[PDB]
Protein backbone atom coordinates (compact mmCIF):
# COMPACT_ATOMS: atom_id res chain seq x y z
CA UNK A 1 0.00 0.00 0.00
CA UNK A 2 0.92 3.68 -0.16
CA UNK A 3 1.34 3.81 3.63
CA UNK A 4 4.15 1.25 3.68
CA UNK A 5 5.88 3.18 0.89
CA UNK A 6 5.74 6.35 2.99
CA UNK A 7 6.98 4.50 6.06
CA UNK A 8 9.93 3.13 4.08
CA UNK A 9 10.81 6.63 2.86
CA UNK A 10 10.66 8.04 6.40
CA UNK A 11 12.82 5.20 7.72
CA UNK A 12 15.30 5.57 4.86
CA UNK A 13 15.60 9.29 5.63
CA UNK A 14 16.15 8.87 9.37
CA UNK A 15 18.59 5.97 9.00
CA UNK A 16 20.53 7.81 6.28
CA UNK A 17 21.11 10.62 8.79
CA UNK A 18 22.94 8.22 11.16
CA UNK A 19 21.17 9.70 14.21
CA UNK A 20 23.33 7.88 16.79
CA UNK A 21 26.68 8.97 15.30
CA UNK A 22 26.44 12.57 16.48
CA UNK A 23 28.83 14.71 18.48
CA UNK A 24 25.83 15.68 20.61
CA UNK A 25 22.50 13.89 20.97
CA UNK A 26 19.37 15.67 22.21
CA UNK A 27 16.83 12.89 21.82
CA UNK A 28 14.35 14.64 24.13
CA UNK A 29 13.97 17.51 21.65
CA UNK A 30 12.60 15.07 19.05
CA UNK A 31 9.75 13.98 21.33
CA UNK A 32 6.24 15.02 20.28
CA UNK A 33 3.48 13.66 22.54
CA UNK A 34 0.91 14.87 20.01
CA UNK A 35 1.72 11.81 17.87
CA UNK A 36 1.01 9.17 20.53
CA UNK A 37 -0.83 6.31 18.76
CA UNK A 38 -4.48 5.60 19.45
CA UNK A 39 -4.20 1.88 18.58
CA UNK A 40 -1.48 -0.72 19.16
CA UNK A 41 -1.25 -4.47 19.70
CA UNK A 42 -1.24 -5.21 23.44
CA UNK A 43 -1.38 -9.03 23.39
CA UNK A 44 -1.05 -11.85 20.89
CA UNK A 45 -0.74 -15.63 20.65
CA UNK A 46 0.51 -17.66 17.69
CA UNK A 47 -1.94 -20.50 16.97
CA UNK A 48 -1.03 -20.48 13.28
CA UNK A 49 -0.49 -24.24 13.05
CA UNK A 50 -4.20 -24.88 13.67
CA UNK A 51 -6.36 -21.74 13.76
CA UNK A 52 -4.31 -18.57 13.13
CA UNK A 53 -3.10 -15.60 15.16
CA UNK A 54 -5.24 -13.89 17.78
CA UNK A 55 -4.42 -10.50 19.23
CA UNK A 56 -5.70 -7.79 21.56
CA UNK A 57 -5.71 -4.06 20.84
CA UNK A 58 -5.02 -1.39 23.44
CA UNK A 59 -8.77 -0.66 23.66
CA UNK A 60 -9.35 -4.25 24.90
CA UNK A 61 -10.92 -5.18 21.56
CA UNK A 62 -9.92 -8.58 20.21
CA UNK A 63 -9.22 -9.88 16.73
CA UNK A 64 -7.93 -12.97 14.98
CA UNK A 65 -6.41 -13.49 11.53
CA UNK A 66 -7.42 -17.02 10.58
CA UNK A 67 -5.35 -19.25 8.31
CA UNK A 68 -8.04 -18.87 5.63
CA UNK A 69 -7.03 -15.18 5.39
CA UNK A 70 -10.28 -13.96 6.95
CA UNK A 71 -10.59 -11.75 10.02
CA UNK A 72 -13.07 -11.43 12.88
CA UNK A 73 -13.12 -8.62 15.44
CA UNK A 74 -14.84 -8.33 18.82
CA UNK A 75 -15.16 -4.67 19.87
CA UNK A 76 -14.78 -3.58 23.49
CA UNK A 77 -18.55 -3.77 24.05
CA UNK A 78 -18.27 -7.57 24.03
CA UNK A 79 -21.10 -8.18 21.55
CA UNK A 80 -20.64 -6.27 18.29
CA UNK A 81 -18.41 -7.87 15.67
CA UNK A 82 -16.72 -7.17 12.34
CA UNK A 83 -15.86 -9.89 9.81
CA UNK A 84 -13.46 -9.19 6.93
CA UNK A 85 -13.32 -11.88 4.26
CA UNK A 86 -10.48 -12.69 1.87
CA UNK A 87 -11.76 -10.17 -0.68
CA UNK A 88 -12.12 -7.59 2.09
CA UNK A 89 -15.87 -7.04 2.55
CA UNK A 90 -16.45 -5.45 5.97
CA UNK A 91 -19.57 -7.05 7.47
CA UNK A 92 -20.90 -6.12 10.91
CA UNK A 93 -22.85 -8.38 13.27
CA UNK A 94 -23.01 -9.39 16.93
CA UNK A 95 -22.54 -12.42 19.16
CA UNK A 96 -26.18 -12.15 20.25
CA UNK A 97 -27.26 -12.57 16.62
CA UNK A 98 -25.82 -16.10 16.83
CA UNK A 99 -24.67 -16.21 13.18
CA UNK A 100 -24.55 -19.82 12.06
CA UNK A 101 -21.88 -19.40 9.38
CA UNK A 102 -19.47 -17.75 11.86
CA UNK A 103 -20.30 -19.78 14.97
CA UNK A 104 -17.04 -21.74 15.01
CA UNK A 105 -14.89 -18.67 14.37
CA UNK A 106 -16.74 -16.83 17.14
CA UNK A 107 -16.02 -19.66 19.57
CA UNK A 108 -12.32 -19.65 18.67
CA UNK A 109 -12.03 -15.88 19.07
CA UNK A 110 -13.65 -16.11 22.51
CA UNK A 111 -11.00 -18.71 23.40
CA UNK A 112 -8.19 -16.44 22.17
CA UNK A 113 -9.67 -13.63 24.27
CA UNK A 114 -9.89 -15.90 27.32
CA UNK A 115 -6.28 -17.08 27.19
CA UNK A 116 -4.86 -13.61 26.55
CA UNK A 117 -6.84 -12.03 29.39
CA UNK A 118 -5.87 -14.72 31.91
CA UNK A 119 -2.25 -15.35 30.87
CA UNK A 120 -0.73 -12.32 29.10
CA UNK A 121 0.32 -8.81 30.10
CA UNK A 122 -1.16 -5.74 28.42
CA UNK A 123 1.59 -3.81 26.64
CA UNK A 124 1.09 -0.07 26.93
CA UNK A 125 -1.04 -0.31 30.07
CA UNK A 126 0.75 2.75 31.49
CA UNK A 127 -0.20 4.99 28.54
CA UNK A 128 -3.45 6.72 27.63
CA UNK A 129 -4.04 6.48 23.86
CA UNK A 130 -4.32 9.76 21.98
CA UNK A 131 -7.61 11.57 21.63
CA UNK A 132 -10.66 11.65 23.83
CA UNK A 133 -12.27 10.12 20.75
CA UNK A 134 -13.08 6.49 21.44
CA UNK A 135 -14.93 6.73 18.11
CA UNK A 136 -11.86 6.07 15.96
CA UNK A 137 -12.37 3.26 13.47
CA UNK A 138 -10.99 0.05 14.93
CA UNK A 139 -8.16 -1.29 12.73
CA UNK A 140 -7.50 -4.92 11.88
CA UNK A 141 -4.34 -6.95 11.35
CA UNK A 142 -3.63 -6.86 7.62
CA UNK A 143 -0.62 -9.18 7.84
CA UNK A 144 2.14 -10.33 10.17
CA UNK A 145 5.29 -12.42 10.24
CA UNK A 146 7.90 -13.64 12.71
CA UNK A 147 11.69 -13.61 12.61
CA UNK A 148 13.99 -15.24 15.13
CA UNK A 149 14.21 -11.87 16.92
CA UNK A 150 10.85 -10.12 16.58
CA UNK A 151 7.23 -10.28 15.48
CA UNK A 152 6.12 -7.76 12.83
CA UNK A 153 2.49 -6.60 12.94
CA UNK A 154 0.96 -4.55 10.11
CA UNK A 155 -2.38 -2.96 10.99
CA UNK A 156 -4.96 -1.79 8.46
CA UNK A 157 -4.52 1.89 9.41
CA UNK A 158 -0.92 1.78 8.15
CA UNK A 159 0.70 1.35 11.55
CA UNK A 160 3.57 -1.14 11.79
CA UNK A 161 4.47 -2.57 15.20
CA UNK A 162 7.64 -4.54 15.90
CA UNK A 163 8.00 -6.41 19.20
CA UNK A 164 11.49 -7.68 20.05
CA UNK A 165 11.39 -10.98 21.89
CA UNK A 166 14.47 -11.03 24.10
CA UNK A 167 14.30 -7.61 25.78
CA UNK A 168 10.60 -6.79 25.21
CA UNK A 169 11.37 -3.49 23.47
CA UNK A 170 8.71 -2.42 20.98
CA UNK A 171 8.31 -0.02 18.06
CA UNK A 172 5.01 1.50 16.91
CA UNK A 173 5.47 3.30 13.58
CA UNK A 174 2.83 5.78 12.38
CA UNK A 175 3.39 6.77 8.73
CA UNK A 176 0.53 9.30 8.80
CA UNK A 177 2.59 11.49 11.14
CA UNK A 178 6.11 10.24 10.34
CA UNK A 179 6.36 9.32 14.02
CA UNK A 180 7.49 6.36 16.11
CA UNK A 181 6.64 5.32 19.66
CA UNK A 182 9.37 3.37 21.44
CA UNK A 183 8.79 1.16 24.48
CA UNK A 184 12.04 0.37 26.28
CA UNK A 185 12.87 -2.47 28.68
CA UNK A 186 11.42 -0.56 31.65
CA UNK A 187 8.12 -0.03 29.75
CA UNK A 188 8.61 3.74 29.41
CA UNK A 189 6.84 5.00 26.29
CA UNK A 190 8.39 7.77 24.18
CA UNK A 191 6.92 9.16 20.95
CA UNK A 192 9.13 10.91 18.40
CA UNK A 193 8.94 12.67 15.06
CA UNK A 194 11.21 10.71 12.73
CA UNK A 195 12.15 14.00 11.03
CA UNK A 196 13.21 15.47 14.39
CA UNK A 197 15.31 12.41 15.24
CA UNK A 198 17.25 13.26 12.07
CA UNK A 199 17.88 16.74 13.44
CA UNK A 200 18.59 16.00 17.12
CA UNK A 201 19.97 12.44 17.09
CA UNK A 202 19.13 9.47 19.28
CA UNK A 203 20.71 6.63 21.22
CA UNK A 204 22.13 3.56 19.50
CA UNK A 205 19.31 1.48 20.99
CA UNK A 206 16.59 3.31 19.05
CA UNK A 207 18.78 3.91 16.00
CA UNK A 208 19.61 0.22 15.58
CA UNK A 209 15.95 -0.76 15.86
CA UNK A 210 14.94 1.81 13.24
CA UNK A 211 17.54 0.19 10.98
CA UNK A 212 15.91 -3.17 11.66
CA UNK A 213 12.42 -1.73 11.12
CA UNK A 214 13.40 -0.55 7.64
CA UNK A 215 14.44 -4.05 6.60
CA UNK A 216 11.16 -5.40 8.00
CA UNK A 217 9.12 -2.82 6.08
CA UNK A 218 10.97 -3.86 2.93
CA UNK A 219 9.91 -7.43 3.70
CA UNK A 220 6.28 -6.34 3.99
CA UNK A 221 6.47 -4.65 0.58
CA UNK A 222 8.16 -7.62 -1.11
CA UNK A 223 5.13 -9.72 -0.17
Amino acid sequence: DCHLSDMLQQLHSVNASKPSERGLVRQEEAEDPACIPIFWVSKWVDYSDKYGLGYQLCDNSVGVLFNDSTRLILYNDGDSLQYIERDGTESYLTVSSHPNSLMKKITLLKYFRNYMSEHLLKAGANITPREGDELARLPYLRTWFRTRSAIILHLSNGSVQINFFQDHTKLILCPLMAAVTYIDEKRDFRTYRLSLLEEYGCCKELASRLRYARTMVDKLLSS
Binding site: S42, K43, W44, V45, D46, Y47, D49, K50, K104, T107, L108, Y111, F112, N114, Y115, M116, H119, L120, L121, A123, R146, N163, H168
Partner: protein
Amino acid sequence: YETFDPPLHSTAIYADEEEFSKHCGLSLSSTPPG
Protein backbone atom coordinates in the same frame (compact mmCIF):
# COMPACT_ATOMS: atom_id res chain seq x y z
CA TYR B 1 -23.31 -38.73 4.36
CA GLU B 2 -22.95 -35.48 2.42
CA THR B 3 -26.46 -34.33 3.36
CA PHE B 4 -26.05 -35.53 6.98
CA ASP B 5 -26.23 -32.18 8.79
CA PRO B 6 -27.54 -32.61 12.35
CA PRO B 7 -28.88 -29.30 13.71
CA LEU B 8 -28.13 -30.18 17.36
CA HIS B 9 -25.45 -32.30 19.00
CA SER B 10 -23.04 -32.51 21.90
CA THR B 11 -19.95 -30.31 22.06
CA ALA B 12 -17.79 -30.34 18.93
CA ILE B 13 -14.07 -31.05 18.99
CA TYR B 14 -13.08 -27.47 18.19
CA ALA B 15 -15.04 -26.30 21.26
CA ASP B 16 -12.64 -27.96 23.74
CA GLU B 17 -11.29 -24.85 25.45
CA GLU B 18 -9.05 -26.96 27.71
CA GLU B 19 -7.08 -28.23 24.71
CA PHE B 20 -7.11 -24.72 23.24
CA SER B 21 -5.55 -23.12 26.32
CA LYS B 22 -3.13 -26.05 26.59
CA HIS B 23 -1.90 -25.38 23.05
CA CYS B 24 -1.67 -21.61 23.58
CA GLY B 25 0.58 -22.25 26.57
CA LEU B 26 2.78 -24.42 24.36
CA SER B 27 2.71 -22.02 21.40
CA LEU B 28 4.53 -18.72 21.12
CA SER B 29 2.70 -15.70 22.53
CA SER B 30 3.25 -12.19 23.88
CA THR B 31 4.85 -11.61 27.28
CA PRO B 32 3.22 -13.08 30.40
CA PRO B 33 3.31 -11.73 33.96
CA GLY B 34 6.64 -12.40 35.64
